[PDB]
Nucleic acid binder design. Sequence first.
RNA 1: GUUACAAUAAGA
RNA 2: GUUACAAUAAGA
Lengths: 240, 240
Amino acid sequence: HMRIEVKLLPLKDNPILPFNYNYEVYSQILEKVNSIEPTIAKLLSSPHGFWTFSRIIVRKRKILPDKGIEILSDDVSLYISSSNEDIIRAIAEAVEKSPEFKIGELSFLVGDIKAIKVKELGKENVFSTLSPIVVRTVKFEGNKLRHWDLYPHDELFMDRLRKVMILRYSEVMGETPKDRDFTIEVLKFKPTRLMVGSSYIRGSLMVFRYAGSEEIARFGYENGFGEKTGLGFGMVKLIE
Amino acid sequence: HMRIEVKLLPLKDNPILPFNYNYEVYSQILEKVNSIEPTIAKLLSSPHGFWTFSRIIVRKRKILPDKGIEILSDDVSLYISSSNEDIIRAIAEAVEKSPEFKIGELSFLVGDIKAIKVKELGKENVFSTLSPIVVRTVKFEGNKLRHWDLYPHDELFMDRLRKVMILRYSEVMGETPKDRDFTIEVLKFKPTRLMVGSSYIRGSLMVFRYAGSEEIARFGYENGFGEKTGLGFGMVKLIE
RNA sequence: GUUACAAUAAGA
RNA sequence: GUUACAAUAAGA
């Protein structure tokens, strides 16, 4: 499966990355791809998770709780993934043509794009999250129905996630997977709250072990696990 | 200040360290230090935190969620600290004369005890928790009286932590500290729940910046921050 | 693709 | 004693 690393260069001195970029990055890419491949842009913007992208990785940093993350590195990377290398292809082009990113007060400049080597999977895999995994349910709170976010320690999590993947899979892949059974067991777990647009989404940054269906595993690896993947959630990476 | 690194060598075939070890380490040090020096043993047993020790540190490890932390290193390490170099000196002796330590299933053997080079503090410090930091208030749950454990997001957190350090300080240093003010801002934060004996204590694993009274700063640095430090809570290390 | 493995979570 | 910096936390 195709996965790319986009290097970004912070423009000014003492650059500071704001804590919640998910919507900015996503909408920015959408706009850029839409200029070239409007037809693919429509896939990016789909809820079904045609792709993922990670957090913006800052290899060396300090924290300014009121401002954001201090970038002490010369550059930052952003990993993007998809089962469809036509989506990858189109993103590389769009970005490189118009390599100007504005996140809050910090402007970046796209440096090298490159396709990344990606490891084969096994019967069981140990994944670490590259961007928070999101699994949502509906709950009556007051009157109006609203979105309740789940974490692995919640009872309905595994069952909800299972259905989200099967569902998502058949939607983007075109068919339902033959083996639909799988489990995950959490190893290192943390909660995070992200403001995307005018909303709030809460998710898990975790290291977990996946077992079971070998096609859903490929699917999650390539397209991210959980919901809102296209918004920058759900990307994992293989460790041992 | 005086800070030691006690090394532990796992005896069992496949070494699983249980997730909740405080009480067992506490109560076992408490004895080995009693048999040798009953008098110092009572400073340890005091609620006021005449000392701290850290999580048992395992460099190479992996998680069995129903079991514990699988130990993949040759040795693990405990870090004990105190403003009183007599206490530390006593623990090192007491532990050397009775090197056996049992935790859950695992039996350890005390290896080399050694001193740790400890940097001087500044006007401002960035500390990391070697032990989670515990700050409690009391609350009524129905007609029953309950411990309620606090984290920095709680309005009452800063307030009760000041009072707890000021109280601890005087009850051990012997006098009230001159400068009684400090602030703590959180950089990296994760919550943890430990079972110590019959009861559950929740606390904070975190990196934070300490601004304030220098004598309080050095007191927490030596004797731990927050409460219950005698049980292996609140130990910090200085970073950059 | 080292921010690449500390779970559990208000308990009597 | 590098498990050594991702805060914030149920909203309209």
